[PDB]
């Protein structure tokens, strides 16, 4: 538009839940409903206590995941764009932005826990989805892995930004895109943790 006085501001990304991995059972928890999410996106002020490594995040139009690794909350650019994230003292600007990698990052929220970058060199991985499904993935290249059991794309939608983990629970990568044919996801593409470590 040409009328700057009425130009709108995009809201903040908002943490609305988490994938609980602290015990023997993975499960999703919601920490904020849709109305409170809307309010928090506009103010950028989120007073909720943050816990865990994998957050469920939302904008006005999308929901996806974000994963703390080495004190940075990482997610995908196709979800967050250049948006700030809401925090107790207001909006927080991204400290990493790389559209070529489909990658953004903010300082990790106070109270969050960070995953350690994997140095195991192992190819037996586990994808964690927004529904707290743990999906075995065999690593097939620097940024690719195959599902041991393929599943319709619907079961992976909304899990970009989530982690691929090694058998020891280290972060190996961030889920970016799916490889699907006839609607069935047979493989996943992820941002390797080394690419995060280079971006850092
Ligand atoms: C056909 C398909 C499955 C839709 C698509 N496959 C696909 O493109 O595969 C090719 C071949 C193998 C790698 C990939 O190379 C292209 C790179 C794509 C990309 F990822 F780097 C990407 N960079 C962007 C940078 C800037 C702006 C937009 C971008 N858009 C991108 O990709 C787009 C988005 C990405 C996506 O849907 N991700 C997921 C997801 O859950 N999102 S989400 O949470 O619902 C949501 C949309 C709320 C945020 C995990 C997959 C879930 F659904 F399984 N896409 C399309 C796909 O996965
Ligand atoms: Zn490891």
Curated annotation (Swiss-Prot):
Catalytic activity: Hydrolysis of four peptide bonds in the viral precursor polyprotein, commonly with Asp or Glu in the P6 position, Cys or Thr in P1 and Ser or Ala in P1'; a ribonucleoside 5'-triphosphate + H2O = a ribonucleoside 5'-diphosphate + phosphate + H(+); ATP + H2O = ADP + phosphate + H(+)
Names of the cofactor(s): Zn(2+); Mg(2+)
Region annotation (NS3-binding) ranges: 12-21
Record localization: Host endoplasmic reticulum membrane
Membrane-related topology note: Peripheral membrane protein
Cofactor binding description: Binds 1 zinc ion, which has a structural role. The magnesium ion is essential for the helicase activity.
Active site: 78, 102, 160
Binding-site list for Zn(2+) 1: 118, 120, 166, 170
Domain notes from UniProt: The N-terminal one-third of serine protease/helicase NS3 contains the protease activity. This region contains a zinc atom that does not belong to the active site, but may play a structural rather than a catalytic role. This region is essential for the activity of protease NS2, maybe by contributing to the folding of the latter. The NTPase/helicase activity is located in the twothirds C-terminus of NS3, this domain contains the NTPase and RNA-binding regions.
Quaternary structure and interacting proteins, as annotated: Interacts with protease NS2. Interacts with non-structural protein 4A; this interaction stabilizes the folding of NS3 serine protease. NS3-NS4A interaction is essential for NS3 activation and allows membrane anchorage of the latter. NS3/NS4A complex also prevents phosphorylation of host IRF3, thus preventing the establishment of dsRNA induced antiviral state. Interacts with host MAVS; this interaction leads to the cleavage and inhibition of host MAVS. Interacts with host TICAM1; this interaction leads to the cleavage and inhibition of host TICAM1.
General function of this protein: Displays three enzymatic activities: serine protease with a chymotrypsin-like fold, NTPase and RNA helicase. NS3 serine protease, in association with NS4A, is responsible for the cleavages of NS3-NS4A, NS4A-NS4B, NS4B-NS5A and NS5A-NS5B. The NS3/NS4A complex prevents phosphorylation of host IRF3, thus preventing the establishment of dsRNA induced antiviral state. The NS3/NS4A complex induces host amino acid transporter component SLC3A2, thus contributing to HCV propagation.
Protein name: Serine protease/helicase NS3
Organism: Hepatitis C virus genotype 1a (isolate 1) (HCV)
Upper taxonomic lineage: Viruses, Riboviria, Orthornavirae, Kitrinoviricota, Flasuviricetes
Parent sequence residues shown: 1030 to 1688 of 3011
